[PDB]
Symmetry: C2
Subunit: 122 residues, 2 copies
């Protein structure tokens, strides 16, 4: 059930990365402009996209290792695990500590405007 | 810091960062696209811009410590030292290591097309 599986995983991964960022922003957000905050949310979606194949390699081996028929809920749980086990807070700290949060551009707004279920992955 | 001094520093810093990137690329650039390489050259300019206030305080201290009035040759030297010693390699490793090199955008090509002397910084 391929796309139901991709959708629940994307929702959980983005949700999880977004939780890390919103938590981080409560501590560090004072210093950043609203555009810089939106850029970091873009970063979350882009990070998921550029690591999607690696997450799928790994998810494929975890389902396989179920010795069981995968239900969509398996995918929900594997996505939630990626969402909390990727250290995005390190990434925010490094990027902001290097003063290199990129400018908020229309192409970033475009990605942020999609529903999480529709964020394109390959 | 006066305009003439600003200009020799931007030239030397961008040149130094560019040399560091050119070096790093020999090791780490085999599988990047031309686009991705051009983004890291943009990153060098952007890095200088966002660290400009930091470099200006460092420069002020170095100049206070010179033991004589400063002249443009001192600023050329300090810009070259920043160009050499900032570690752009830890930043290039971070972007490439995480597969987060940004796409090459039109605004980036615009910044890359300026002469280093004309890259805007907050110094006016």
């Amino acid at each position: 059930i391929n796309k139901a599986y991709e959708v629940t995983m994307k929702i959980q991964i983005i949700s999880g990365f977004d939780r890390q960022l919103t938590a981080w922003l409560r501590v560090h957000g004072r210093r950043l402009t609203n555009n810089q905050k939106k850029t970091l949310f873009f970063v979350n979606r882009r990070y998921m996209q550029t690591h999607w194949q690696n997450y799928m390699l790994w998810v494929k081996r975890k389902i396989k290792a179920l010795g069981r028929p995968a239900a969509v809920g398996d995918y929900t749980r594997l996505g939630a695990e990626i969402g909390r086990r990727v250290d995005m807070v390190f990434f925010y700290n490094f990027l902001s500590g290097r003063k290199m949060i990129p400018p908020y551009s229309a192409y970033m707004a475009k990605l942020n405007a999609l529903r999480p279920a529709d964020v394109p992955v390959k």
